[model samples]
Target: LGKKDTETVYSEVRKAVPDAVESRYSRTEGSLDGT
Candidate 1:
């Protein structure tokens, strides 16, 4: 890794990172949420 700027860091990570996963949960119990 090299020294990256704030803006570049975010953009580069979006592609460089493999586990860039996103999750969502509802108000009730669900697989994403233990509630």
Candidate 2:
């Protein structure tokens, strides 16, 4: 799990349930939002 970041999981979770995730960001800034 060295290369794998915990945020990556959260990012996926956000995709699964965006409403449930209160985090303004799923991972890095502007991630999954827009380029």
Candidate 3:
């Protein structure tokens, strides 16, 4: 397989797992504030 560009790889991952990624970061920030 050919190597993919960094931007393309990020786009693919972002498209496929945006929710999981957002939720993970959201939880971390929210918990840090104890909200």
Best by TM-score: 2
lDDT of 3 at 2: 66
Error of 3 at 14 (Å): 1.1
Prediction 3 TM-score vs. true: 0.35
lDDT of 2 by residue, 1-35 (tens): 46488898888877867543533455554455432
**Model 1 misplacement above 4 A:** 1-4, 17-35
Clashing pairs in 3: none
Once model 1 is optimally superposed onto the true structure by TM-score, how far is the C-alpha of residue 32 displaced, in angstroms?
Answer: 25
State model 1's lDDT: 0.50
Q: Which 10-residue window of candidate 2 scores lowest in summed lDDT?
A: 26-35
TM-score of each: 0.30, 0.37, 0.35
- After TM-score superposition, the amount by which residue 22's alpha carbon in candidate 1 deviates from its true location, in angstroms, is 12
lDDT of 1 by residue, 1-35 (tens): 77558888888777734332322334434435322
Question: For residues 1-35, could you state the per-residue lDDT of candidate 3 as single tens digits?
Answer: 66469888888777757556666667555533212
Q: What is the C-alpha RMSD of each candidate to the true structure, in Å?
A: 7.5, 8.5, 6.8
Order of candidates by lDDT, top first? 3, 2, 1
**Global lDDT of each candidate:** 0.50, 0.59, 0.62
With candidate 2 superimposed using the best TM-score fit, by how many Å does residue 11's alpha carbon deviate from the native? 0.2
